[PDB]
Write a protein that binds this DNA or RNA. Structure first.
Ligand code: MG
Length: 864
RNA sequence: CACCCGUGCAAAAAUGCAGGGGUCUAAAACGACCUGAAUAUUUCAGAUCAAA
RNA sequence: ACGUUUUGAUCUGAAAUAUUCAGGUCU
């Protein structure tokens, strides 16, 4: 649960050399430091405004007392006495991988004698553990635009590298090699693909406006640049290529020129056509003010609208105007085509209220709101304040409202601008020249993934570049060494990368479809749904032609031909699934009932009661299985009369829930796969780390378990392990995880029964995503799925035994395929056998092999 | 309902007590004023669509 | 042949709720 230290105000307890600093929470997540402690003699910094006083300063515990919030007193622990409790009891603590000195020399110049540096090293390593989950399912989406309906095992995107340009990859067209030629033919297949129009914000250039493809010069410049990033988050790539993203200024002329255009077209759409796109709105606001100048009006309207600097004021204007407009004249039925613009002009006029005129009323209001004894005062603090405020603005928003009828907005929208402002151009969100190549690269990463996880990419990169900056204002405040090595100096600019990415968070939206892609989006509807036609592929797009017949002039009374052109093309959930899953594969993925019936457990109770009532004319256990076997056998007509029409209505009303079960299932089986992408990156990362720590590891591309042996001193000698157990190995392991005997023991037990060859397949199964990229074959017999750890591993234990269906395997592994198939669930002992390569890191090894310990949200029970 | 660490206690190898951990995993950070983003419902208005 | 009235769907706009990620404040 809670930790009473950080509830008492102690941020972190740094230890340098002999003394022990101790920090606290600044404004936000920057660190002010409270007091150093040389032993039992504390010198307090930060004299005025203390965050906590210290009571009993022992040799081991630092009992503090804090007065932020309700005043709690907690005891912290001496970092110098860590690992030295029962033995001279004063030393700096190394990290539990016992790789702290190598990590310090590798990023900075030399070793150190603190732990302020190594808490910063584990936040520079950490932006691979949160960028391999958002760069894998952005390359899973691109691998499902092949639509191969087969065993898919290609390697197109991880083959890509920015070591070559386009013009020499162009020379692989007429190439002579039997594998280089196929890759350009794999590229010819991909630029001639029509499903690139799904990602039109990064593949289409605006040139009314008729946007078309990029050149082959630049489509290669996105697929390579998004392909190198996925290959960098899965593997080692010794040399400068390991330091790839940390020097993105080393890219060629092409890749900056594609980052400088994929970033400009949303930032020039929002600046170069701002007054044009708000011309109907600025002219209202000029008419209601008439005393300010319109050049600074569109400045303070721009800070209100999109930049959103000064919009946070501690009181919700979106609730404030509604207590103002409760029961007033603007709740009519006529204003409903106006409330898009009426409610944001009304909101803006209050925003200029609480800046220019009565800004002193706002601080009165915020201080009022922090004294809520109940909630009922809040609905009469605003309504009391709106009772004042409508007396001020009722003439003004009437002048707005009568100027917003059905035809004034037509005649206002046809005027010439002639506003010619340069006070506005100061506060523009800046273009692609004064923003870095990192921000432009993780911009282009957010052009391939959904809106729930743009907001988790470019806010966990707000946080990590702010928890790197805050350490660089402690060890720079304490005079410690800070200069990174010159081949790694990316993070001096983490003060401005925090400033670029906050600017990036202000305007990123989802990757917009284009208009002229209905015809290929409609084709990828009927094979999600299984409405296949017996005619050939070159003779069914004319069906797609004559139903759409362009944007939409669909025929009248055409039945299900134009049902699935009106609703399920323009629906939200379909736009998520066809950018994500394989189109012509995920109907027969949905045919397994117990995988589906699992997935709508964590689909909410208010969600299923919308669809149970849409299909049945009552308990949520048996309500869910009533329509889990309706999503599975969905049925549509091929390409009495009451029953055969009402079964269509119960198949057309489940079509949104079907289309979101196959999204949540087909996503969460690669958020689980990205746990093993992290692990197989953090094994090839620790190979070049432990090999420089004087630990003779050896090769790892032949055998992935070589690190977790060479950490624990065990070796093969004739093809298997004949170095069995005693006590003296556990004291000589090169890791603080493998010190204790039983955790050394059972990893040694599991390592002796895991062959080399099945791990090398499990290597390029989680990295090229082949466990789920052809999921429909691998899921065909489930007896029961209880959690996504089980559903992932049965999908990965079949893919082994699908390939080890002819090859010779030894008896220890060959038990597990029999244990896989005498049941139909996954084999809980086989799942720990090939998960060993990342078994040197014990807490990664336990949390990635037993469900219950796997998931943050779903805690369970250990194995023992 | 994890792993490591420290102190306290019984014991010889581990468990109890309360802790701490950004240097433990994907995972350091109370609470209540908001903001940005999207989830999912409900109500209203609207425009298409299917069927009766 | 041609218009209905309903029902059930999508979507867009507004409001209400709950969840999640992040930072803006404050004690
Ligand atoms: Mg960490």
């Amino acid at each position: 649960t809670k930790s009473m230290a950080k509830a008492a105000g102690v941020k972190s307890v740094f230890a340098v050399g002999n003394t022990v600093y101790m920090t606290s929470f600044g404004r936000g997540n920057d660190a002010v430091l409270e007091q150093k402690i040389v032993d039992t003699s504390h010198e307090p910094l930060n004299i005025d405004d203390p965050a906590y006083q210290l009571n009993v300063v022992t040799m081991n515990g630092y009992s503090v007392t804090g007065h932020r919030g309700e005043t709690v007193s907690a005891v912290t622990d001496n970092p110098l006495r860590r690992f030295n409790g029962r033995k001279p009891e004063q030393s700096v603590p190394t990290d539990m991988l016992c790789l702290k000195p190598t990590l310090e020399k590798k990023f900075f110049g030399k070793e150190f004698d603190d732990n302020i540096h190594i808490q910063l090293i584990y936040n520079i390593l950490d932006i691979e553990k949160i960028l391999a989950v958002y760069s894998t399912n952005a390359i899973y989406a691109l691998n499902n635009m092949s639509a191969d309906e087969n065993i898919e095992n290609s390697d197109f995107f991880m083959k890509r590298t920015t070591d070559e340009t386009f013009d020499d990859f162009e020379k692989k067209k007429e190439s002579t090699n039997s594998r280089e030629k196929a890759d350009f033919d794999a590229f010819e297949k991909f630029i001639g693909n029509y499903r690139l129009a799904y990602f039109a914000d990064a593949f289409y250039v605006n040139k009314k406006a008729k946007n078309v493809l990029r050149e082959d010069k630049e489509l290669y410049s996105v697929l390579t640049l998004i392909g190198k990033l996925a290959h960098w988050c899965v593997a080692s790539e010794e040399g400068r290529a390991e330091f790839w993203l940390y020097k993105l200024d080393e890219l060629k002329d092409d890749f900056k020129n594609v980052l400088d255009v994929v970033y400009n077209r949303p930032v020039e759409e929002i600046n170069n056509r701002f007054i044009e796109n708000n011309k109907v709105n600025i002219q209202i606001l000029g008419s209601v003010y008439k005393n300010t100048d319109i050049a600074e009006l569109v400045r303070s309207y721009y800070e209100f609208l999109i930049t959103k600097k000064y919009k946070n004021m501690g009181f919700s204007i979106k609730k404030l105007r509604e207590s103002m407009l409760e029961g007033k004249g603007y709740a009519d039925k006529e204003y409903d085509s106006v409330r898009n613009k009426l409610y944001q002009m009304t909101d803006f006029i209050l925003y200029t209220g609480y800046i220019n005129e009565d800004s002193d009323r706002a601080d009165d209001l915020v201080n009022t709101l922090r004294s809520s004894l109940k909630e009922d005062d809040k609905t009469t603090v605003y309504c009391k304040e709106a009772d004042y405020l409508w007396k001020k603005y009722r003439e003004s928003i009437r002048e707005v409202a009568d100027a917003l009828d059905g035809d004034n907005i037509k005649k206002l929208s046809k005027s010439n601008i002639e506003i010619q402002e340069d006070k506005l151009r100061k506060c523009f969100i800046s273009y692609a020249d004064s923003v870095s190549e990192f921000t432009k690269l993780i911009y282009l990463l957010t052009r391939f993934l959904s809106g729930k996880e743009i907001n988790d990419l470019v806010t966990t990169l707000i946080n990590k570049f702010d928890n790197i900056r805050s350490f660089l204002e402690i060890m720079d405040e304490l005079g410690l060494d800070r200069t990174f090595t010159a081949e790694y100096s990316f993070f001096e600019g983490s003060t401005k990368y925090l400033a670029e990415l906050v600017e990036l968070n202000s305007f990123v939206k989802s990757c917009s479809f284009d208009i002229n892609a209905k015809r290929t989006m409609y084709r990828d509807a009927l094979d999600i749904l299984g409405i296949e036609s017996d005619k050939t592929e070159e003779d069914i797009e004319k069906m797609i032609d004559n139903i759409l017949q362009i944007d939409k002039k669909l025929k009248k009374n055409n039945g299900l031909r134009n049902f699935i052109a009106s609703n399920v093309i323009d629906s939200n959930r379909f736009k998520y699934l066809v950018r994500y899953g394989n189109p012509k594969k995920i109907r027969e993925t949905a045919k397994c009932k117990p995988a589906v019936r699992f997935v709508l457990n964590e689909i909410p109770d208010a969600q299923i009661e919308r669809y149970y009532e849409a299909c049945c004319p009552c308990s949520a256990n048996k309500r869910r299985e009533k329509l889990a076997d309706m999503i599975a056998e969905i049925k549509f007509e091929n390409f009495s009369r009451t029953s055969e029409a009402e079964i269509k209505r119960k198949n057309q009303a489940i079509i949104r829930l079907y289309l979101t079960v196959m999204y949540i299932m087909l996503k969460n089986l690669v958020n689980v796969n990205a746990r093993y992408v992290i692990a197989f990156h953090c094994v090839e990362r620790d190979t070049k780390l432990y090999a420089e720590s004087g630990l003779e590891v050896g090769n790892i591309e032949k055998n992935k378990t070589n690190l977790t042996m060479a950490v624990m001193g065990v070796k093969l000698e004739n093809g298997i392990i004949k170095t069995e157990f005693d006590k003296s190995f556990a004291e000589n392991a090169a890791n603080r995880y493998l010190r204790n005997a039983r955790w050394y023991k059972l990893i040694l037990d599991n390592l002796k029964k895991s062959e080399r060859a099945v791990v090398n397949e499990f290597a390029n199964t989680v990295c090229a995503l082949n466990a789920i990229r052809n999921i429909n074959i691998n899921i065909k017999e489930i007896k029961e799925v209880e959690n996504y750890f089980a559903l992932y591993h049965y999908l990965i234990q079949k893919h082994l035994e699908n390939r080890f269906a002819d090859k010779k395997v030894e008896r220890d592994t060959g038990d597990f395929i029999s244990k896989l198939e005498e049941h139909k669930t996954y084999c809980k002992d086989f799942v720990k056998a090939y998960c060993t390569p990342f078994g040197y890191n014990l807490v990664r090894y336990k949390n990635l092999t037993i469900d219950g310990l796997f998931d943050k949200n779903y805690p369970g029970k250990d194995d023992s």
